[PDB]
């Protein structure tokens, strides 16, 4: 169980293991990339052709 | 690590230290001990477990 409680992949579990073991996590850029990936996954789970159809309706 | 080798074999030695890189033995030991602790804590009712800890 992670902070959000979702079932982590074993790779993420080992990443958490090693981060706890060394006493420190990833860098700032890596954290930004991870949160961007999480936001992208959340947006994909929540789901652009309607706008295209509306635009194509006009000649 | 805890792999005993008889006779120096450079290929096996380098392959083993690649596989067990970054304290992998300690990592798997910590993983198994944490999994055991969590499992014991989850079913602590029927086991009459008062304290389930690990030494230093």
């Amino acid at each position: 169980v992670d902070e959000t409680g979702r079932k982590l992949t074993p790779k993420e579990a080992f990443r958490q293991l090693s981060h706890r073991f060394h006493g420190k996590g990833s860098g700032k850029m890596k954290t930004e990339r991870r949160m961007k990936k999480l936001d992208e996954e959340a947006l994909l789970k929540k789901m652009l052709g309607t706008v295209a159809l509306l635009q194509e309706k006009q000649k | 690590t805890g792999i005993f080798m008889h006779g120096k074999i450079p290929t096996l030695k380098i392959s083993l230290i690649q596989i067990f890189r970054a304290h992998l033995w300690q990592k798997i030991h910590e993983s198994i001990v944490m999994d055991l602790c969590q499992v014991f804590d989850q079913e602590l009712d029927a086991l009459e477990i008062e304290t389930v800890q690990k030494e230093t």
Binding site: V1, L17, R20 | -
Partner: peptide, 22 residues
């Protein structure tokens, strides 16, 4: 059925004690 977060020991780069904290 729920599982509380799992803690771990930071043995690496820890000068607080020779033995791992518990």
């Amino acid at each position: 059925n729920v599982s509380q977060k799992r803690k771990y020991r930071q043995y690496m780069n820890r000068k607080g004690g020779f033995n791992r904290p518990l």
